[PDB]
Design a protein around this ligand. Sequence first.
Ligand code: HEM
Ligand code: HEM
Lengths: 362, 361
Amino acid sequence: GSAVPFHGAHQAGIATPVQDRLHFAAFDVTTEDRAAFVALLKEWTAAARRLTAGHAVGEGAYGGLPEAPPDDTGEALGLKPSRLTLTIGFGPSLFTRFGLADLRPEALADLPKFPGDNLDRARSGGDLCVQACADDPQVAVHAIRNLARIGFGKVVVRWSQLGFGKTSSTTPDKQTPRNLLGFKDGTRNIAGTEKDRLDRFVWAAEKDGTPWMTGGSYLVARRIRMHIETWDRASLQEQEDVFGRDKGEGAPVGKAKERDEPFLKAMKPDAHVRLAHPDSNGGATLLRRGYSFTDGTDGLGRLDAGLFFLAYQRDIRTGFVPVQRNLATDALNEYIQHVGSAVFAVPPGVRDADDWWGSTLF
Amino acid sequence: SAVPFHGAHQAGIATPVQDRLHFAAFDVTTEDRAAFVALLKEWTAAARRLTAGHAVGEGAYGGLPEAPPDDTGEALGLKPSRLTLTIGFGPSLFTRFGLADLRPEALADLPKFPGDNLDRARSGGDLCVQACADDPQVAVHAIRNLARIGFGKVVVRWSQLGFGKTSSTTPDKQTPRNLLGFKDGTRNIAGTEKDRLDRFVWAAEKDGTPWMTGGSYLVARRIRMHIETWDRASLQEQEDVFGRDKGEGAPVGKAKERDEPFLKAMKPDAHVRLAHPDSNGGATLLRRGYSFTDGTDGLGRLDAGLFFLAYQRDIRTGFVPVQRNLATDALNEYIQHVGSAVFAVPPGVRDADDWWGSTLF
Ligand code: HEM
Ligand code: HEM
């Protein structure tokens, strides 16, 4: 239940160990005054320093003047930090404002249309986002609510997504979680310890072209519905064929252990692992950090389930795009549908107590 | 780590409150009494497996490659996580299978209450399964697999995820706070109070419905909070609405949370004052609800609130009088009841040969 440090060269919440719960929100900016927006960023950074340490924002949740609303809404009182991280990102549409056009990064590429895409524009896009991750879902909701509260009149929430449980791993020494299809998810990811792999595949460099993004990353979010009725009547062999790993151990087909290296030629030509593997993609590698969700029924007598997929990479054009292009023939496509999409530039870390979110851009 | 499944009562009522909830209401699609009893027996077998941390049937893997696995497998490698599974029967169940005359009188239809805004789609249900656990994935896997086993005989009508405390970081003796920032649960029936459970919670034989002896009656209300409006109210307005201060949760005029309230020092329409048993002829409830946050609606607003669950010996003498007395609650300014259901929760599964609903069928 400890705290994750808030300051660093990079923002926490990426290479950090994946916490149990997600509350992700996308925001549209509603002010034209760039000075007001910078003031917002400074105030949000100050709140996040309190929040990530387990402190109430402002002057606290009670004890102030009776006739004023309290600074902090109060529902996280007496809770530990719970490994809360807060990660902010800037959407492509933001750079149409405040005179930022010339500063939008080349690596903040718009996604092309992919086959099967059925994207809902209400749950897509966003001028910016905040990814709140914690082991306690009340801690995460409290942080989103209080950021939105502070930004009233300058930002509004466009759409949000709660993940009730992780389906990713940055800690290969810990148990790999399973997604709602019942398969381990996260075996061959990037570990928060693999410093060289993060430099090569995740962190933006100065040489890459955009100096203010040095130390940041780029985020692709995809809301993906699962056809669980269809999946749940498929045979065990069909399910294992679709992925290329067995269901129980999660081992590559033909091998004994989850972490044995896959031998791709033994997998079906349309197996998900075979098609997603860096070797099939010229070395393209992603940091996967997604969460499972369920949002009630579908109105047709079934549960509604899916995966809120999040990938961090050094450059959307050499990471998510080529891999997703190679999944056009994926056998998994029969059982899923992408229904929400958004990309963000995640800026560098807040260096110390005088720094603030987005300072290198603004 | 696990909660015993068998008992004179079903678990998940008086047993310790777990961190997470997945509540599902089901509608019945079969007219065949025999087919329904068959499913009740199949569900009970699955509940025994699930609550002990085992896969249903012949497992999540290792069976024939050309068959679908008996268990969908997303709980593999997880612990029992204090999973309890509690089943209830809705009044509409008793229009089927010839059971009309077996409906308990204590399973009363709720009156319409001032300010109700009930979504038909997220109300009612032929039956329900309350799945409580410290791991949300354990709870979801339980609902997911019972619905699968029942496919063809029942459909899921509506489902609600909820959270309370996170036990792995919050002390056990600490009152949780609801999403309005106030401690919630201070004056409640505790599972340790066997005499209050007999008086206020468990159905007795002389209550008039023998098959329900050892059962209870459940009211579910999905209560939206108007978060953004609440958060612009002054600290003094918030405390006036409840009759307790926000920091400590002490009744006005006292200094400790568990000090007994002086009701005359609260505002006349304070929530505690109107809800208290002394203002309702002694009517007392076991509250066992969970917070929810489902996302954000079309106007940018937080879709969040309290999934209110109350157990009582008779709906007519528990939930109805108290909710009636809330007609003028100052809290009504900030909440809206948007979903509702009632259920008869049968007595417990006595042993390995017993099954859910055996006393009724
Ligand atoms: C509901 C949607 C998806 C599900 C259920 C799913 C599931 C899985 C599973 C079970 C594995 C094997 C274990 C592992 O190494 O993590 C895996 C691997 C992987 N997946 Fe997916 N996946 C989904 C979507 C995606 C998408 C959209 C992408 C990229 C656009 C992707 C990229 C990858 C990659 C890169 C690997 C690692 C393969 C390797 O390097 O060995 N997945 N996925
Ligand atoms: C969003 C909806 C509600 C919220 C946030 C809420 C909150 C609270 C709070 C903070 C307390 C004081 C602490 C405690 O004793 O638990 C309380 C007490 C109580 N509430 Fe509510 N409540 C809600 C709805 C209801 C409803 C619908 C009922 C019953 C119809 C109810 C019945 C009670 C009772 C019986 C008490 C105990 C009073 C006593 O004996 O001191 N509440 N509630």
